[PDB]
């Protein structure tokens, strides 16, 4: 798990999308991402490079 996890520390980024809790990593924050196709998933925080797999892993997500 790690403990009580909300949005206290962490900046968020709209257009470079780059998010960190560490107050270390906002002030060594560089806004520059190439963020052509990857998908996160919260629970299996291993992103996907591909779309169409995630859409089948949704599928897995959703019950009966
Ligand atoms: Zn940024
Ligand atoms: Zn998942």
Same mark, same amino acid.
């Given at each position: 798990?790690?403990?009580? @996890? !909300?949005?206290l520390?962490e900046?968020i /980024?709209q257009l470079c999308?780059?998010?960190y @809790?560490?107050?270390f990593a906002? $002030?060594? *924050? +560089? /806004? &520059? !991402?190439?963020? !052509?196709?990857?998908?996160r /998933?919260?629970?299996? @925080? +291993?992103?996907? &490079? /591909?779309p $169409?797999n995630?859409? &089948? *892993?949704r599928?897995? *997500? +959703?019950? !009966?």
């Amino acid at each position: 798990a790690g403990g009580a @996890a !909300r949005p206290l520390g962490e900046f968020i /980024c709209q257009l470079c999308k780059e998010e960190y @809790a560490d107050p270390f990593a906002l $002030a060594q *924050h +560089k /806004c &520059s !991402r190439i963020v !052509r196709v990857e998908y996160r /998933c919260p629970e299996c @925080a +291993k992103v996907f &490079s /591909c779309p $169409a797999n995630l859409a &089948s *892993h949704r599928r897995w *997500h +959703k019950p !009966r």
